[PDB]
Amino acid sequence: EIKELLKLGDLPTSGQIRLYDGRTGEQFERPVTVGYMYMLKLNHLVDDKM
Amino acid sequence: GDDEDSHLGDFIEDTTLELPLDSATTESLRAATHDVLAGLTAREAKVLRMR
Amino acid sequence: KPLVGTGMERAVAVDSGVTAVAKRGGVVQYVDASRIVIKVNEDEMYPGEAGIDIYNLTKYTRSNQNTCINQMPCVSLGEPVERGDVLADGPSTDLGELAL
Amino acid sequence: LEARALMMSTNNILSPANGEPIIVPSQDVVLGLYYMTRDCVNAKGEGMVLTGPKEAERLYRSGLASLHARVKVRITEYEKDANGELVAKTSLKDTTVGRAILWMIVPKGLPYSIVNQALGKKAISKMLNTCYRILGLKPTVIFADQIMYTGFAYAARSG
Amino acid sequence: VTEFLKPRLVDIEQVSSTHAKVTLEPLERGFGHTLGNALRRILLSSMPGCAVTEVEIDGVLHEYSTKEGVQEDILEILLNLKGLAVRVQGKDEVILTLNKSGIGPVTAADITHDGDVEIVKPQHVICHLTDENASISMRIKVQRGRGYVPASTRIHSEEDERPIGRLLVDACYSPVERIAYNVEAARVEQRTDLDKLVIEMETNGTIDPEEAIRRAATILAEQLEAFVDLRD
Amino acid sequence: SVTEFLKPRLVDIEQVSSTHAKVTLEPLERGFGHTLGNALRRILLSSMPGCAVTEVEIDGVLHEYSTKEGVQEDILEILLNLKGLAVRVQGKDEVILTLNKSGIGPVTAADITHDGDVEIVKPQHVICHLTDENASISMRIKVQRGRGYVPASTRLLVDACYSPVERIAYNVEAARVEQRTDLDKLVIEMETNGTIDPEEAIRRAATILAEQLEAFVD
Amino acid sequence: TPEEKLLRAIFGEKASDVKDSSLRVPNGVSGTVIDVQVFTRDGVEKDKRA
Amino acid sequence: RVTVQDAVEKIGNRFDLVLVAARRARQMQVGGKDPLVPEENDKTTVIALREIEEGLINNQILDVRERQEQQE
């Protein structure tokens, strides 16, 4: 169903698209996995520690 | 407790210390007073050192 | 809100006291960054009552961990509500769901 | 002078429990060096005879050849087979393009068979170790840094 | 060999108000990606803009408060004033005034224009007056810069001293949100290997694509002039 | 202001030899390290004119691979030796240079016949070893002009690296001017084959890139 | 001590007698002072801010 | 200075090297002296260690110079 819901968009079923390097602009070999992970800021801050 | 098993006495500070910056400033001012009194005549210097 | 959740988020957000939930359906008589006034549906008036009930939002306040607890209104003027609908999004919720 | 002379990080590189170097590259580095030093049967530019590691790198970076494309490459390796004399010897090896691109970082005294295989994890630790048993501490610190740099670079390019 | 054909922009396509696709037709082999990556990096980095830099709201002390009658915290009103897309014509800063009262949304159309300032998106909603009687007024402070200057680094110590009711919003002077370049073979009767470069730039409305590319090529040729002759 | 950017106030140009150098450009705007280094590397290593050997006829043996006696080095090793022959050709675009030798003396590049328009930067460049007094070899090599690298697959023909750079790599470090510590420090490092010193190839590529941007600068 | 006596005698900046044990912001924090509550005991009268 | 291998080789010990470098760097820093090696804006530590590399400094040399100083 993930794969189907990818086909609903025009995204690839494999989940791996081909990416280009920012500084040079030459495509990474062997495509990479990019999606939307839901990140959280944990309450371990660097100025509560330094 | 339970943070480090440190009893209460570890956090009571000593407020009678001349902190090393304070002693540094003291002795700097001492040397500066000396090198100022150098720029006075002998009478003025003796009377200001002794007064 | 999480793009990939489970369906637990609304429950965790509501059942905790961060989001201001309606007590009776009605219309949002007046909204504001600090308060929501609801004019109850006449079915739920409790005939002695005046009719409208007020929710005062908890603005920028200090939690135990120095974070900011702050409720934001979700509804808008003249919009219906039903009992159990959230009016104020609490800290780290989004339209009623737990959004960490 | 106790920190500089004694505890500086470029002095302690061997485990004091056992003299194996404690500067083994860990996970992006070894995956970089493995991906680059690992041939496949038919990549771009198969069986070209490059003139040497410089040309293999210039070919790969312009994108004319792939990082694992078995080519004949002319390699000059320096072997201290002497009273520490460092005689030079040039030959024509069969290596991938990445094998030779990586040969550019290896110091003189090391043979060429050190990089001519896939170079997993133990291959890299043994590479640092033979560099230390031949050349000592300064070339090994330089080699370790160059290994980390190239491993991270070709692992990012690995995608 | 003989020589390089120098590229030149054959056409610009305002397929939307903001989305544009320029083209640089004749490019020798290997210069599509050189020019394209350099151009995307310059454009995504160094483009002038008119970020709103402060707000001074009547009756408000800090961002963490609520104005009676407008249903947004002052924090959220400032966050809505961040993305306000404004293009000044003559000065490197300007002080827009926004007066409004009555029940309804407060879009960017509610700001009075100096004539030197053009709000590109006048539908962009700023706040919501949710009171028959409530009234708000701001002195927004647009100014032209480049990059991203947070209020923190902006306030090094101060200019001389800043009054208590003046809020510093985080400035992002960058018209462009997205660059995406395709290089593709160009059907020319003379040579076949030549390719054309096609730059999809996605401004926010306040940068003409031709002026964006010209400014990029100027920023690049400046450094290349610094490179041309060495020196040491 | 808002249009000024920065320029490398200190560009230090080391040279570790006659043909290998290293140029650091200290202060540059943040990220211009890569947008300048990559542009220059791509230009130097993909489109930088120069003359190089393209095809050879070894005068008798065959097409590849070979069977040639009286030459200590197997053929295609002679082709490797020929690819590295750094030649700079005058007004004649292409020229066919013929080399013949007889003896046991090792064959170097000095032994080719002088043609005026063509010059060899390294005449001592070994090409083959005869190894027999009776052994003697003749070859017709063709120097041609082109842009960058052009392999033999795309084309006894040899790969042609016309571009006079044998290797260029650039590294990008950190710099702080007085307060801006997010600045950038370019550290170019290049070796040529001899037709032009490193600093010359660098500025030649910079000029090419500048002229490509000629229809938009103002 | 002397030389402090001599200093204050040369500049006439006589002694305070009163420490500056005041409340200054901790180091590294930079915020807005969003609120101030005051608590005066029933003996202490009150100040203008109170 | 990264690796002190040459300085260690000249003296042939790793604690005595620290001690010799420390006393020479104390001469060069507080007691006041001239580096026997061209200091490239280095602290007295690195100057002392580099000097020990070139053979200009060791314990024998330093005690001999102390003798000469007394003969001053």
Side-chain angles (χ1 to χ4, degrees), chain A, chain B, chain C, chain D, chain E residues 1-158 162-186 188 191-224 226-231, chain F residues 1-58 60-177 180-218, chain G, chain H:
Chain A
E1 292 165 337
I2 293 163
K3 304 285 207 29
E4 202 167 359
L5 205 72
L6 280 186
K7 288 196 177 186
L8 196 49
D10 292 8
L11 323 176
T13 246
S14 179
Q16 299 183 335
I17 75 174
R18 99 185 193 161
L19 259 45
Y20 301 85
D21 187 359
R23 304 103 75 90
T24 73
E26 55 215 28
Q27 179 218 317
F28 296 116
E29 345 174 357
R30 60 162 323 144
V32 335
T33 288
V34 292
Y36 276 79
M37 191 202 273
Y38 183 85
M39 318 279 305
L40 295 66
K41 189 148 116 80
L42 298 187
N43 192 5
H44 298 84
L45 273 32
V46 70
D47 42 345
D48 291 353
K49 304 212 168 312
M50 180 255 261
Chain B
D2 198 63
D3 52 348
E4 178 51 11
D5 198 15
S6 67
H7 60 119
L8 197 178
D10 197 4
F11 311 107
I12 308 179
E13 102 168 6
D14 192 320
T15 327
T16 77
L17 288 180
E18 204 69 17
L19 300 175
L21 227 172
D22 294 326
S23 309
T25 299
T26 284
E27 262 176 342
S28 168
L29 158 91
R30 170 141 173 260
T33 261
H34 178 91
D35 310 5
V36 161
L37 288 196
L40 286 179
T41 121
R43 302 192 54 91
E44 325 275 332
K46 187 177 176 179
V47 171
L48 228 62
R49 266 160 195 272
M50 154 172 54
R51 184 65 276 214
Chain C
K1 43 91 192 63
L3 236 47
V4 196
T6 54
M8 218 77 213
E9 6 270 346
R10 202 164 294 279
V12 185
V14 177
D15 279 331
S16 180
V18 283
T19 181
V21 177
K23 303 174 308 145
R24 304 180 263 171
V27 183
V28 171
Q29 197 196 9
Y30 161 84
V31 209
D32 192 6
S34 325
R35 87 172 29 184
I36 306 166
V37 184
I38 305 255
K39 174 48 183 179
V40 177
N41 295 340
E42 284 203 0
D43 163 62
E44 332 173 33
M45 224 68 124
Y46 279 110
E49 293 182 16
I52 101 267
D53 47 359
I54 307 161
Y55 313 86
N56 296 345
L57 273 34
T58 281
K59 307 316 297 178
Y60 290 78
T61 171
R62 171 199 173 276
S63 73
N64 284 306
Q65 341 272 130
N66 299 344
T67 50
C68 150
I69 320 189
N70 169 31
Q71 311 206 23
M72 308 222 53
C74 281
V75 294
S76 50
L77 278 199
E79 155 165 336
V81 297
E82 40 185 344
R83 76 107 44 187
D85 290 15
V86 314
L87 285 336
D89 254 333
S92 189
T93 82
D94 166 279
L95 278 167
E97 306 197 7
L98 192 64
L100 260 37
Chain D
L1 279 143
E2 291 174 358
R4 181 159 291 274
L6 287 175
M7 318 148 54
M8 172 76 84
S9 151
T10 56
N11 297 291
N12 326 342
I13 75 166
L14 316 171
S15 193
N18 61 91
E20 308 176 22
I22 201 57
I23 309 289
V24 209
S26 300
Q27 42 176 55
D28 309 328
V29 185
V30 348
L31 177 78
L33 272 72
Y34 173 90
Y35 177 78
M36 65 183 319
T37 63
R38 153 93 185 277
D39 56 327
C40 76
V41 55
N42 190 43
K44 270 191 299 174
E46 203 72 342
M48 307 195 194
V49 282
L50 291 354
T51 199
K54 290 155 133 182
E55 166 157 348
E57 186 192 11
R58 162 167 74 268
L59 233 37
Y60 155 73
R61 216 155 263 283
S62 54
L64 299 184
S66 192
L67 193 74
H68 18 261
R70 309 122 136 197
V71 296
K72 295 194 186 308
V73 171
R74 157 176 291 181
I75 307 294
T76 285
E77 29 168 324
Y78 296 78
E79 213 81 9
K80 324 178 59 188
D81 47 275
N83 12 321
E85 296 175 352
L86 256 193
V87 196
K89 157 167 200 174
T90 150
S91 144
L92 226 51
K93 318 291 188 321
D94 315 24
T95 55
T96 82
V97 156
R99 265 96 170 254
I101 293 173
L102 174 66
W103 176 252
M104 313 175 57
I105 77 169
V106 166
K108 299 305 198 197
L110 272 51
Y112 186 72
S113 67
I114 218 82
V115 311
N116 216 334
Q117 10 87 29
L119 276 223
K121 172 77 160 302
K122 281 80 192 72
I124 297 169
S125 194
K126 147 158 175 283
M127 187 158 74
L128 283 166
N129 187 36
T130 76
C131 174
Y132 189 79
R133 301 317 171 169
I134 309 194
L135 288 75
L137 201 108
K138 309 182 187 61
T140 319
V141 157
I142 289 163
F143 194 17
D145 272 312
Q146 279 325 280
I147 264 191
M148 201 196 38
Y149 298 163
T150 172
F152 284 141
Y154 287 82
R157 318 205 56 179
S158 143
Chain E
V1 202
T2 166
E3 243 329 304
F4 296 109
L5 302 173
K6 292 175 186 177
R8 57 179 32 81
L9 61 161
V10 302
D11 67 324
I12 291 185
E13 160 182 340
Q14 294 281 178
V15 61
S16 174
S17 164
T18 78
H19 194 232
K21 318 204 320 178
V22 336
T23 312
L24 280 64
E25 173 76 5
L27 291 162
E28 306 296 346
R29 179 138 298 254
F31 269 97
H33 287 277
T34 320
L35 281 202
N37 193 42
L39 278 193
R40 149 185 171 113
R41 297 184 100 267
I42 311 298
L43 296 179
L44 274 168
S45 72
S46 350
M47 273 322 127
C50 279
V52 10
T53 273
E54 296 161 9
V55 184
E56 186 154 5
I57 295 173
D58 255 352
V60 188
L61 290 318
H62 41 105
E63 314 158 344
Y64 310 89
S65 46
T66 48
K67 197 197 195 65
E68 176 89 29
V70 20
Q71 77 149 298
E72 273 118 350
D73 299 14
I74 300 312
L75 209 306
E76 177 174 350
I77 295 185
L78 295 201
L79 272 50
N80 285 331
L81 274 181
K82 259 187 99 172
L84 169 75
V86 47
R87 181 173 41 189
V88 333
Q89 169 61 9
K91 319 201 168 195
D92 282 8
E93 73 149 18
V94 53
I95 295 224
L96 277 45
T97 291
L98 169 268
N99 277 18
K100 176 73 191 301
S101 77
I103 287 187
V106 168
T107 61
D110 294 332
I111 318 179
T112 314
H113 272 201
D114 317 31
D116 295 314
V117 174
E118 174 178 314
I119 316 284
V120 279
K121 200 190 175 194
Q123 51 169 318
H124 172 89
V125 25
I126 294 177
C127 66
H128 279 95
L129 270 275
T130 180
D131 207 359
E132 301 174 323
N133 181 35
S135 180
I136 102 167
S137 77
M138 342 194 192
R139 284 168 292 287
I140 322 194
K141 207 241 193 182
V142 190
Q143 61 175 340
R144 169 186 299 98
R146 117 156 120 285
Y148 172 71
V149 168
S152 333
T153 90
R154 167 183 310 122
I155 176 175
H156 19 278
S157 64
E158 245 301 316
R162 195 174 37 93
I164 17 205
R166 288 186 62 185
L167 302 342
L168 287 80
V169 349
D170 288 88
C172 331
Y173 324 88
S174 213
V176 311
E177 312 174 19
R178 201 175 54 88
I179 307 264
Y181 71 98
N182 325 332
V183 324
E184 41 211 27
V188 176
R191 255 152 313 281
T192 171
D193 55 325
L194 308 187
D195 9 1
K196 108 236 292 190
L197 181 59
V198 181
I199 317 226
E200 309 180 284
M201 83 179 51
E202 176 110 30
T203 54
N204 59 6
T206 90
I207 247 294
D208 253 325
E210 198 177 6
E211 208 50 72
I213 273 109
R214 290 204 130 262
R215 186 173 320 250
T218 293
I219 300 168
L220 216 192
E222 172 178 10
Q223 321 270 335
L224 285 185
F227 239 97
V228 77
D229 47 339
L230 39 299
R231 320 316 168 279
Chain F
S1 61
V2 76
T3 310
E4 46 80 66
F5 278 87
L6 258 159
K7 284 169 188 57
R9 37 228 45 184
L10 69 99
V11 13
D12 148 59
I13 165 167
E14 304 179 41
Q15 50 201 15
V16 236
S17 32
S18 185
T19 177
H20 170 27
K22 141 167 168 179
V23 193
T24 87
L25 303 94
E26 167 70 349
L28 300 156
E29 283 284 26
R30 191 191 58 159
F32 273 81
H34 300 288
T35 144
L36 290 159
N38 182 39
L40 263 15
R41 181 189 45 79
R42 254 189 153 262
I43 299 188
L44 280 179
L45 164 155
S46 285
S47 42
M48 252 299 288
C51 286
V53 160
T54 286
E55 49 179 33
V56 188
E57 174 65 38
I58 311 294
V61 275
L62 209 252
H63 192 24
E64 326 231 6
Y65 287 78
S66 282
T67 160
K68 180 64 185 307
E69 351 273 311
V71 198
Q72 153 179 329
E73 313 174 347
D74 183 16
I75 305 195
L76 130 158
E77 174 173 315
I78 295 189
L79 294 201
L80 256 115
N81 302 123
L82 276 188
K83 178 197 315 199
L85 172 60
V87 184
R88 33 167 58 171
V89 185
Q90 287 302 154
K92 282 288 186 181
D93 162 83
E94 171 191 83
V95 24
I96 142 172
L97 301 87
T98 289
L99 163 62
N100 313 320
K101 206 169 182 173
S102 318
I104 313 178
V107 175
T108 66
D111 310 322
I112 321 188
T113 180
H114 280 141
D115 313 317
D117 310 11
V118 167
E119 295 200 319
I120 329 297
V121 13
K122 176 161 187 175
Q124 63 172 335
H125 193 211
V126 182
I127 305 183
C128 66
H129 274 52
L130 294 192
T131 230
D132 274 2
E133 193 89 1
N134 173 38
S136 183
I137 85 161
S138 59
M139 72 174 39
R140 310 188 304 284
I141 132 208
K142 161 136 108 158
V143 304
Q144 199 159 349
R145 222 187 295 261
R147 230 74 179 208
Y149 206 105
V150 170
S153 107
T154 310
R155 201 191 302 94
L156 292 167
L157 64 169
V158 321
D159 286 345
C161 27
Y162 307 97
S163 76
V165 303
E166 272 172 309
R167 131 187 179 84
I168 165 150
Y170 75 103
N171 182 51
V172 168
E173 355 234 317
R176 48 88 43 111
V177 161
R180 291 100 63 70
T181 62
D182 56 80
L183 282 244
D184 200 296
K185 169 181 191 175
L186 190 51
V187 209
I188 301 208
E189 167 179 20
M190 78 164 309
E191 336 174 17
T192 89
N193 63 4
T195 76
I196 60 183
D197 50 313
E199 146 172 20
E200 181 180 358
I202 281 193
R203 119 180 33 187
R204 197 164 306 247
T207 295
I208 283 178
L209 189 47
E211 310 176 9
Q212 304 299 318
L213 297 181
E214 198 157 89
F216 329 99
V217 174
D218 45 20
Chain G
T1 82
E3 300 124 357
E4 189 67 6
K5 295 166 68 182
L6 167 49
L7 212 181
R8 297 193 167 274
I10 273 184
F11 298 160
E13 174 68 356
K14 252 311 99 193
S16 291
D17 105 293
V18 52
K19 297 217 62 167
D20 198 12
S21 148
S22 85
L23 157 83
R24 40 193 78 246
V25 175
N27 184 19
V29 343
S30 308
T32 307
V33 169
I34 66 184
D35 206 20
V36 181
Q37 321 165 357
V38 202
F39 306 114
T40 305
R41 186 160 54 62
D42 24 84
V44 196
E45 41 168 37
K46 258 154 183 182
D47 41 349
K48 323 173 202 181
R49 191 75 136 89
Chain H
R1 182 172 193 74
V2 179
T3 70
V4 314
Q5 211 185 12
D6 291 20
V8 137
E9 292 285 359
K10 283 280 185 175
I11 296 229
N13 194 352
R14 184 167 262 280
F15 315 110
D16 312 344
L17 161 81
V18 168
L19 286 174
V20 170
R23 72 95 69 89
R24 168 82 179 114
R26 169 150 299 108
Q27 295 187 354
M28 194 168 4
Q29 152 181 114
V30 162
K33 293 280 186 171
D34 47 355
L36 280 44
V37 100
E39 52 168 23
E40 289 126 298
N41 198 341
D42 292 325
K43 329 298 280 292
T44 42
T45 309
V46 189
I47 299 178
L49 287 187
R50 293 165 46 193
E51 288 190 319
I52 293 173
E53 270 204 22
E54 333 277 330
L56 287 191
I57 275 309
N58 50 22
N59 188 20
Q60 169 68 227
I61 269 61
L62 290 163
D63 296 327
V64 155
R65 303 244 188 87
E66 299 293 347
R67 259 86 181 194
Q68 303 255 20
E69 156 262 28
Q70 285 306 317
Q71 318 307 59
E72 174 234 10

mmCIF file of all heavy atoms in Angstrom, chain F residues 184-203:
data_model
loop_
_atom_site.group_PDB
_atom_site.id
_atom_site.type_symbol
_atom_site.label_atom_id
_atom_site.label_comp_id
_atom_site.label_asym_id
_atom_site.label_seq_id
_atom_site.Cartn_x
_atom_site.Cartn_y
_atom_site.Cartn_z
ATOM 1 N N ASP F 184 35.488 31.506 3.708
ATOM 2 C CA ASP F 184 35.906 30.357 2.917
ATOM 3 C C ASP F 184 37.279 30.573 2.297
ATOM 4 O O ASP F 184 37.603 31.687 1.887
ATOM 5 C CB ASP F 184 34.867 30.095 1.835
ATOM 6 C CG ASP F 184 34.937 28.711 1.304
ATOM 7 O OD1 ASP F 184 35.978 28.377 0.713
ATOM 8 O OD2 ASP F 184 33.962 27.953 1.488
ATOM 9 N N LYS F 185 38.056 29.497 2.179
ATOM 10 C CA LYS F 185 39.472 29.564 1.831
ATOM 11 C C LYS F 185 39.810 28.515 0.785
ATOM 12 O O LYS F 185 39.920 27.333 1.109
ATOM 13 C CB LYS F 185 40.319 29.350 3.077
ATOM 14 C CG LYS F 185 41.780 29.135 2.829
ATOM 15 C CD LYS F 185 42.485 28.926 4.139
ATOM 16 C CE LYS F 185 43.972 28.975 3.967
ATOM 17 N NZ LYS F 185 44.639 28.898 5.287
ATOM 18 N N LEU F 186 40.010 28.945 -0.450
ATOM 19 C CA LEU F 186 40.201 27.983 -1.523
ATOM 20 C C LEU F 186 41.674 27.624 -1.666
ATOM 21 O O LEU F 186 42.558 28.471 -1.546
ATOM 22 C CB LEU F 186 39.672 28.545 -2.826
ATOM 23 C CG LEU F 186 39.582 27.564 -3.967
ATOM 24 C CD1 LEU F 186 38.856 26.360 -3.494
ATOM 25 C CD2 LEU F 186 38.817 28.198 -5.061
ATOM 26 N N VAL F 187 41.937 26.340 -1.911
ATOM 27 C CA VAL F 187 43.285 25.789 -1.796
ATOM 28 C C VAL F 187 43.725 24.972 -3.002
ATOM 29 O O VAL F 187 44.283 23.887 -2.830
ATOM 30 C CB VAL F 187 43.442 24.945 -0.528
ATOM 31 C CG1 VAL F 187 44.869 24.991 -0.080
ATOM 32 C CG2 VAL F 187 42.550 25.445 0.556
ATOM 33 N N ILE F 188 43.419 25.440 -4.209
ATOM 34 C CA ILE F 188 43.683 24.761 -5.479
ATOM 35 C C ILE F 188 45.057 24.110 -5.515
ATOM 36 O O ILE F 188 45.991 24.598 -4.884
ATOM 37 C CB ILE F 188 43.552 25.763 -6.635
ATOM 38 C CG1 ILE F 188 42.154 26.367 -6.649
ATOM 39 C CG2 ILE F 188 43.885 25.133 -7.947
ATOM 40 C CD1 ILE F 188 41.700 26.798 -7.995
ATOM 41 N N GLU F 189 45.181 22.990 -6.215
ATOM 42 C CA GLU F 189 46.433 22.245 -6.245
ATOM 43 C C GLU F 189 46.516 21.492 -7.555
ATOM 44 O O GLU F 189 45.803 20.509 -7.738
ATOM 45 C CB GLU F 189 46.502 21.281 -5.075
ATOM 46 C CG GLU F 189 47.598 20.263 -5.185
ATOM 47 C CD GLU F 189 47.628 19.354 -3.990
ATOM 48 O OE1 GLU F 189 46.592 19.272 -3.300
ATOM 49 O OE2 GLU F 189 48.679 18.729 -3.737
ATOM 50 N N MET F 190 47.404 21.917 -8.447
ATOM 51 C CA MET F 190 47.347 21.403 -9.802
ATOM 52 C C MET F 190 48.739 21.161 -10.340
ATOM 53 O O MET F 190 49.678 21.883 -10.020
ATOM 54 C CB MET F 190 46.615 22.362 -10.729
ATOM 55 C CG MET F 190 47.439 23.530 -11.161
ATOM 56 S SD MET F 190 46.649 24.280 -12.573
ATOM 57 C CE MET F 190 46.450 22.830 -13.576
ATOM 58 N N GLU F 191 48.846 20.158 -11.196
ATOM 59 C CA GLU F 191 50.062 19.846 -11.917
ATOM 60 C C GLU F 191 49.745 19.729 -13.394
ATOM 61 O O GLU F 191 48.762 19.101 -13.776
ATOM 62 C CB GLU F 191 50.656 18.535 -11.424
ATOM 63 C CG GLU F 191 50.246 18.178 -10.020
ATOM 64 C CD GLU F 191 50.734 16.809 -9.615
ATOM 65 O OE1 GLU F 191 51.641 16.283 -10.292
ATOM 66 O OE2 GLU F 191 50.210 16.256 -8.627
ATOM 67 N N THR F 192 50.588 20.318 -14.226
ATOM 68 C CA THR F 192 50.425 20.243 -15.665
ATOM 69 C C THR F 192 51.458 19.287 -16.240
ATOM 70 O O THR F 192 52.312 18.765 -15.526
ATOM 71 C CB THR F 192 50.554 21.621 -16.314
ATOM 72 O OG1 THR F 192 51.924 21.872 -16.626
ATOM 73 C CG2 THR F 192 50.078 22.683 -15.361
ATOM 74 N N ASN F 193 51.362 19.045 -17.544
ATOM 75 C CA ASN F 193 52.298 18.149 -18.201
ATOM 76 C C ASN F 193 53.544 18.858 -18.697
ATOM 77 O O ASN F 193 54.527 18.188 -19.021
ATOM 78 C CB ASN F 193 51.624 17.419 -19.363
ATOM 79 C CG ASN F 193 51.154 18.344 -20.459
ATOM 80 O OD1 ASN F 193 51.375 19.548 -20.416
ATOM 81 N ND2 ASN F 193 50.497 17.777 -21.463
ATOM 82 N N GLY F 194 53.524 20.189 -18.775
ATOM 83 C CA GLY F 194 54.699 20.980 -19.091
ATOM 84 C C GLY F 194 54.449 22.076 -20.105
ATOM 85 O O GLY F 194 55.227 23.030 -20.177
ATOM 86 N N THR F 195 53.381 21.956 -20.895
ATOM 87 C CA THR F 195 53.109 22.992 -21.881
ATOM 88 C C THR F 195 52.869 24.342 -21.223
ATOM 89 O O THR F 195 53.219 25.377 -21.796
ATOM 90 C CB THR F 195 51.906 22.629 -22.732
ATOM 91 O OG1 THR F 195 50.723 22.839 -21.960
ATOM 92 C CG2 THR F 195 51.977 21.191 -23.154
ATOM 93 N N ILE F 196 52.266 24.362 -20.039
ATOM 94 C CA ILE F 196 52.059 25.595 -19.290
ATOM 95 C C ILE F 196 52.221 25.293 -17.812
ATOM 96 O O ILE F 196 51.803 24.233 -17.340
ATOM 97 C CB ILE F 196 50.675 26.211 -19.565
ATOM 98 C CG1 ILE F 196 49.584 25.228 -19.172
ATOM 99 C CG2 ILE F 196 50.540 26.600 -21.020
ATOM 100 C CD1 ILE F 196 48.206 25.708 -19.468
ATOM 101 N N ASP F 197 52.837 26.216 -17.083
ATOM 102 C CA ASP F 197 52.979 26.074 -15.646
ATOM 103 C C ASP F 197 51.610 26.123 -14.990
ATOM 104 O O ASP F 197 50.639 26.557 -15.602
ATOM 105 C CB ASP F 197 53.872 27.178 -15.103
ATOM 106 C CG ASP F 197 53.454 28.532 -15.588
ATOM 107 O OD1 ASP F 197 53.207 28.667 -16.801
ATOM 108 O OD2 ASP F 197 53.364 29.461 -14.763
ATOM 109 N N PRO F 198 51.509 25.685 -13.733
ATOM 110 C CA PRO F 198 50.185 25.613 -13.087
ATOM 111 C C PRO F 198 49.448 26.939 -13.043
ATOM 112 O O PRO F 198 48.264 27.006 -13.407
ATOM 113 C CB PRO F 198 50.526 25.121 -11.681
ATOM 114 C CG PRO F 198 51.812 24.408 -11.840
ATOM 115 C CD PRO F 198 52.571 25.187 -12.852
ATOM 116 N N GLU F 199 50.129 28.005 -12.625
ATOM 117 C CA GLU F 199 49.494 29.312 -12.545
ATOM 118 C C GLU F 199 48.995 29.785 -13.898
ATOM 119 O O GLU F 199 48.039 30.560 -13.969
ATOM 120 C CB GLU F 199 50.472 30.328 -11.967
ATOM 121 C CG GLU F 199 50.309 31.718 -12.546
ATOM 122 C CD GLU F 199 51.144 32.755 -11.832
ATOM 123 O OE1 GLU F 199 52.113 32.368 -11.148
ATOM 124 O OE2 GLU F 199 50.823 33.957 -11.952
ATOM 125 N N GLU F 200 49.610 29.330 -14.983
ATOM 126 C CA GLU F 200 49.127 29.740 -16.292
ATOM 127 C C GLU F 200 47.849 29.016 -16.662
ATOM 128 O O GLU F 200 46.917 29.629 -17.189
ATOM 129 C CB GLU F 200 50.182 29.492 -17.357
ATOM 130 C CG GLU F 200 49.740 29.926 -18.724
ATOM 131 C CD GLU F 200 50.798 29.680 -19.773
ATOM 132 O OE1 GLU F 200 51.893 29.203 -19.412
ATOM 133 O OE2 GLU F 200 50.535 29.961 -20.961
ATOM 134 N N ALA F 201 47.792 27.711 -16.408
ATOM 135 C CA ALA F 201 46.579 26.962 -16.702
ATOM 136 C C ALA F 201 45.411 27.469 -15.875
ATOM 137 O O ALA F 201 44.281 27.555 -16.371
ATOM 138 C CB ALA F 201 46.802 25.476 -16.454
ATOM 139 N N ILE F 202 45.668 27.819 -14.613
ATOM 140 C CA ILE F 202 44.600 28.310 -13.751
ATOM 141 C C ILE F 202 43.978 29.566 -14.329
ATOM 142 O O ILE F 202 42.753 29.664 -14.475
ATOM 143 C CB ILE F 202 45.129 28.575 -12.338
ATOM 144 C CG1 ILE F 202 45.259 27.279 -11.560
ATOM 145 C CG2 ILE F 202 44.184 29.491 -11.642
ATOM 146 C CD1 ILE F 202 45.462 27.500 -10.101
ATOM 147 N N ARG F 203 44.806 30.544 -14.678
ATOM 148 C CA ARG F 203 44.277 31.806 -15.174
ATOM 149 C C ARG F 203 43.691 31.652 -16.570
ATOM 150 O O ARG F 203 42.755 32.367 -16.932
ATOM 151 C CB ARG F 203 45.365 32.867 -15.158
ATOM 152 C CG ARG F 203 45.679 33.416 -16.511
ATOM 153 C CD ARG F 203 46.764 34.443 -16.386
ATOM 154 N NE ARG F 203 47.674 34.088 -15.306
ATOM 155 C CZ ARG F 203 48.643 34.874 -14.868
ATOM 156 N NH1 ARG F 203 48.824 36.064 -15.418
ATOM 157 N NH2 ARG F 203 49.425 34.478 -13.876
#
